[PDB]
Nucleic acid binder design. Structure first.
Lengths: 98, 93, 204, 198, 176, 125, 32, 96
RNA sequence: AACUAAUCCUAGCCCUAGCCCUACAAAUAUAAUUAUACUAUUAUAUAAAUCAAAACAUUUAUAAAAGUAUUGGAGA
């Protein structure tokens, strides 16, 4: 088994100089073991690509698939750690990059 | 296939150890010893092939004669069956 | 096995206006009745422990330990500080890069109060200007300024294991005087959450 | 089964050596009982390690791994009490030292002197230093339960000291069963009929 | 009494109960024959109470206070038996010279092995005991092949033992 | 006594006496509902109810009115890591009713700053 | 290293012991 | 007991063991011993030791007095047979 | 720097040499492993064939002299 996605979240960038733009935050979150088909989960993943944090949460809340409920929990967990550990000042200011 | 991800430790071998250094000594025992002892007499190993060589069937047959009485009953029966296959292969093909 | 004991045997009470402050040195002599007998106990095992000269040795440990934070020299910092102090210094610095520097001390360091199978804790008074800037995992600056000096007065407690022949003075704890101002605030903004209630429940 | 700092059969040992584990065994040079000279409570000097050159008292000996454990020496740092509410407190955790990594200390002169085993007048084996020959007495170690024999106070169901030491046996040609009969006067006049053992 | 099956009411709920060392063999030997018989029951009574308490602990899913107490009693009880057995053994040897309390002899089974057969007392003799005669204490002729196999098996074990040692020797060189 | 050989009896033979008893018994709180005078015991499977009656009457001087004994089968369903069935030891439960009007009841055994987060409280800076 | 001594055979008459089981029959014959 | 004809149980009083219970009143030996109590050096009793302790003094005294003979070996404690004793050392006929 | 995966070194073996060998309780041959009577109590035939003779039939091995003479559906 490989867990390099977590290691991507452990990456620490060098201290930015005062004359350097504020680096946009990147958060890597994953759920390794889900009793669900990846293909079915991929369909949910494909649609939500590039959407905002709030928009994705709203869409998931009214989704009927079991995987969507799992994604919402994963998404909520990612948002919590992003503010808690990745210095995300605004909860709304988040979007699904990947 | 896949290969090792780690290098084996380095190993150093001494080529001048007594065994290698003295390998072959007294091989001229016969010519330098008045031929009293033949170099074949210096062979140590299985009794049936000390100073003797032959084909697989001959080696097996000689082995049976030398230690047949001192061999296990199960081994002797297996050797007898093995000899049959060797005999037919060489003597009929 | 413990080479240190959490907490301070007796907490020294700082007087307001000590930052403005001979004088305070005499206060130790007045309070030496409370502390000198303790000073003798450290002297008995060592005999070279003096309140006048300890701060210089104590000051180096304090600065050096802070320097290890910049380089994350955990092994070095272990020796400088006691087991209790080590987690405090580095626990909240996880996944952070900090540039820390020590500006010239505003006033000379002086031993303030000491106490003591036997563990001796020495309170030292330090007023020093320092520069601190902590950055995020991504390098974003989150606290302090890179090269701005902040003047802070604090009382620092070092500890030593008197019984052990190799026992040495290691940084143990810091006493914060009440009159000291609050530390600089974080750049980012926090939110105090409101009460969470179940559906039938009502707001409080 | 690889012997570790964890006691054999413990939960840590079970995790260390699960039933399916077939790790490459670690080979430990066999040491004879006569050869072995390190015992719990012995002051020894660490030849090599984190605290090399520091003399310490042995507290645990895993002879299977030729390991000698010195309290407060060869110490790395770990956190005790790690929990959700609190980060935890750093504490001293000892690491094992191999037999060759320590040497015994001559009492009068503190040095890592090599020793040779020799008997005494009483016959008890005692280590003798190869150089500056001297007797290293066996160190005194407290009882594992922490009970000092003399200080112990008898609790319920505990025979007093004198009662245990009293001798009442009188050599006689009677078994316990026969003796019990005489004291309690059991008498049986019936007799089993002839039995053919086979 | 029923109370004897249970611990002291004060001791109930305690983490442990203070108890001393177990009886050693020599002290029991010093005690008289009658004393040893009396002691065994005294040792047994505590064991039953500790066993009685332990089972209740199992029912309640609770730990047994001072579990070493049971081990100490068993050690005392075990030491008593050997001392009593030793005295019985000594007298038996003197009066009869028999090293075993029960009659026995070495007999050959049908597999060709030699095993100690303990004689059994019967109401009838062996010759009139057809079932005992029916019992087989003789080895069949075909067991000779098995005996040869047993000798060969022992030799194979030694050969395998040398192979086991050789593999261990390899790693010693690798490790050191 | 258990795991021991008892002498064979013939007509006119000696009375059987056990001077030292290897039977060990455990008093257990009733799993089922039983009369208060009734007492449950976990006893070796080789012990007879008469032996228990003699055992209680002699060793413990307990008067007994009635005795009822049952054998509980030990579950063998459990299996180890090797898939080898594990058998629970079978035990015998003895229901003993006291005499002399005595009654029994099982005893009750086992009666940084929030405003400044991310900076350790150690820092005064 | 120094080479091992050259092999030397036992000289002189050697009379086999008839009772010994190991000795072969041909070594006990009058021709021998 | 013994089951008679018709599969009817008939208890044999002889075959039913009688528990001989020692008198534990006043007995100082208890389940445990103090940690204060020192252990004794083990000296297991053996046939030779039992003979030395019990039989040897009697024979030694008689031999010096001259009143020793093969006929009186049983006087010193020899039992020609174990039969007749409630506890027979060999064959063992008693329960522990 | 990705998931699934992959990585490793000893578990031991193999062949000769050497060496022959002569080293708990409880229950049980009844129905083995059933604490005491029943009911008397018990193994082992040329080794064959397969196979070779291209089938199959007598037949077909299992230190030098020497694979020679002899023997053989003179053929394997």
């Amino acid at each position: 088994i490989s867990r390099k996605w977590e290691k991507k979240n452990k990456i620490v960038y060098p201290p930015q100089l005062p004359g350097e733009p504020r680096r946009p935050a990147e958060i890597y979150h994953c759920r390794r073991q889900i009793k669900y088909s990846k293909d079915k989960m991929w369909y949910l993943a494909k649609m939500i690509r590039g959407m905002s944090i709030d928009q994705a949460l709203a869409q998931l809340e009214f989704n009927d698939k079991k995987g969507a409920q799992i994604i919402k929990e994963v998404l909520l967990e990612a948002q919590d750690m992003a503010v808690r550990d990745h210095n995300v000042e605004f909860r709304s200011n988040l979007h699904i990059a990947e | 296939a896949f290969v090792r991800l780690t290098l084996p430790p380095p190993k150093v071998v001494d080529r001048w150890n007594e065994k290698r250094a003295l390998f072959g000594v007294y091989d001229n025992i016969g010519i330098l010893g008045n031929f009293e002892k033949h170099p074949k007499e210096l062979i140590k190993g299985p009794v049936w092939l000390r100073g003797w060589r032959g084909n697989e069937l001959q080696r097996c047959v000689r082995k049976k004669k030398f230690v047949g009485n001192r061999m296990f009953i199960e081994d002797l029966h297996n050797l007898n069956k093995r000899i049959s296959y060797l005999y037919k292969h060489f003597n009929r093909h | 096995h413990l080479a240190c004991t959490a907490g301070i045997f007796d907490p020294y009470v700082p007087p307001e206006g000590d930052a403005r402050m001979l004088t305070q040195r005499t206060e130790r002599l007045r309070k030496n009745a409370a502390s000198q007998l303790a000073i003798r106990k450290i002297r008995e095992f060592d005999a070279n422990f003096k309140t006048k000269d300890f701060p210089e040795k104590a000051k180096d440990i304090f600065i050096e330990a802070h320097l290890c934070l910049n380089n994350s020299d955990h092994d070095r910092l272990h020796t400088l500080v006691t087991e209790h102090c080590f987690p405090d210094m580095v626990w909240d610095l996880k996944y952070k890069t900090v540039r820390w520097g020590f500006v010239e001390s505003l006033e000379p360091a002086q031993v303030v109060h000491v106490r003591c199978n036997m563990y001796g804790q020495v309170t030292v008074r330090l007023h020093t200007r320092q520069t601190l800037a902590i950055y995020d995992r991504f390098g974003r600056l989150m606290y302090g300024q890179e090269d701005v000096p902040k003047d802070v007065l604090e009382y620092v407690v070092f500890e030593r294991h008197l019984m052990n022949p190799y026992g040495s003075w290691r940084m143990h704890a810091k006493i914060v005087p009440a009159w000291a101002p609050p530390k600089q605030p974080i750049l980012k903004t926090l939110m105090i959450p409101g009460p969470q209630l179940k559906p039938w429940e009502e707001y409080e | 089964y690889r012997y570790g700092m964890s006691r054999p059969g413990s939960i840590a040992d079970k995790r260390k050596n699960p039933p399916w584990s077939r790790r490459r065994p670690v080979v430990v040079e066999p040491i004879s009982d006569e050869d072995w000279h390190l015992f719990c409570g012995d002051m020894v000097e660490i030849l090599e390690g984190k605290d090399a050159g520091k003399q310490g008292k042995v507290v645990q000996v895993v002879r299977q791994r030729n390991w000698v454990v010195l309290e407060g020496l060869n110490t790395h740092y770990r956190y005790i009490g790690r929990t959700k509410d609190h980060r935890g407190t750093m504490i001293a955790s000892e690491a094992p030292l191999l037999h060759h990594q320590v040497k015994l200390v001559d009492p009068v002169d503190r040095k890592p002197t090599e020793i040779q085993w020799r008997f005494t007048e009483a016959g008890e084996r005692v280590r003798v230093s190869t150089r500056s020959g001297r007797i290293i007495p066996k160190p005194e170690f407290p009882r594992a339960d922490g009970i000092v024999p003399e200080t112990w106070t008898d609790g319920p169901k505990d025979t007093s000291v004198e009662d245990a030491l009293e001798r009442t046996y009188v050599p006689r040609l009677k078994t316990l069963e026969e003796d019990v009969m005489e004291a309690m006067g059991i008498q049986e006049t019936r007799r089993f009929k002839k039995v053919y053992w086979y | 009494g029923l109370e004897e099956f249970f611990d002291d009411p004060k001791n109930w709920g305690e983490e442990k109960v203070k108890s001393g060392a177990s009886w050693t063999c020599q002290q029991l030997r010093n005690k008289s024959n009658e004393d040893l018989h009396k002691l065994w029951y005294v040792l047994l009574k505590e064991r039953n109470m500790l066993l009685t308490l332990e089972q209740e602990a199992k029912r309640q899913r609770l730990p047994m206070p001072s579990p070493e107490r049971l081990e100490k009693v068993v050690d005392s009880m075990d030491n008593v038996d050997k001392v009593v057995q030793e005295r019985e053994d000594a007298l038996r040897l003197l009066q009869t010279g028999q090293e075993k309390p029960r009659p026995g002899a070495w007999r050959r089974d049908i597999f060709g092995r030699i095993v100690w057969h303990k004689f059994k007392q019967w109401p009838i003799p062996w010759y009139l005991n057809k079932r005992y005669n029916r019992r087989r204490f003789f080895a069949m002729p075909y067991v000779d092949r098995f005996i040869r196999l047993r000798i060969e098996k022992h030799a194979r074990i030694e050969a395998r033992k040398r192979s086991l040692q050789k593999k261990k020797e390899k790693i010693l060189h690798a490790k050191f | 006594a258990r795991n021991v050989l008892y002498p064979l009896y013939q007509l006119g033979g000696p009375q059987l006496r056990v001077f030292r008893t290897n039977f060990f018994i455990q008093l257990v709180r009733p799993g089922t509902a039983q009369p208060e005078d009734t007492v449950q015991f976990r006893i070796p499977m080789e012990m007879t109810r008469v032996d228990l009656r003699n055992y209680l009457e002699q060793i413990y001087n307990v008067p007994v009115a009635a005795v009822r004994t049952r054998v509980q089968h030990g579950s063998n369903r459990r299996r180890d890591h090797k898939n080898v069935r594990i058998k629970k030891p079978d035990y015998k439960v003895a229901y003993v009713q006291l005499a002399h009007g005595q009654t029994f009841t099982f005893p009750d055994l086992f009666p940084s700053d929030l405003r400044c987060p991310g900076i350790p409280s150690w820092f005064g800076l | 290293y120094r080479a091992p001594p050259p092999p030397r055979r036992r000289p002189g008459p050697h009379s086999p012991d008839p009772e010994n089981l190991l000795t072969p029959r041909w070594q006990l014959t009058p021709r021998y | 007991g013994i089951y008679t004809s018709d599969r009817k149980f008939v208890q044999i009083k002889e075959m039913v063991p009688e528990f001989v219970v020692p008198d534990l009143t006043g007995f100082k030996l208890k389940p445990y011993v103090n940690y204060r109590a020192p252990a004794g050096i083990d000296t297991p009793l053996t046939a030779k030791a039992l003979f030395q302790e019990t039989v040897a003094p009697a024979i030694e005294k008689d031999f010096k007095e001259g009143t020793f003979d093969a006929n009186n070996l049983e006087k010193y404690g020899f039992e020609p047979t174990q039969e007749g004793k409630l506890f027979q050392l060999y064959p063992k006929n008693f329960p522990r």
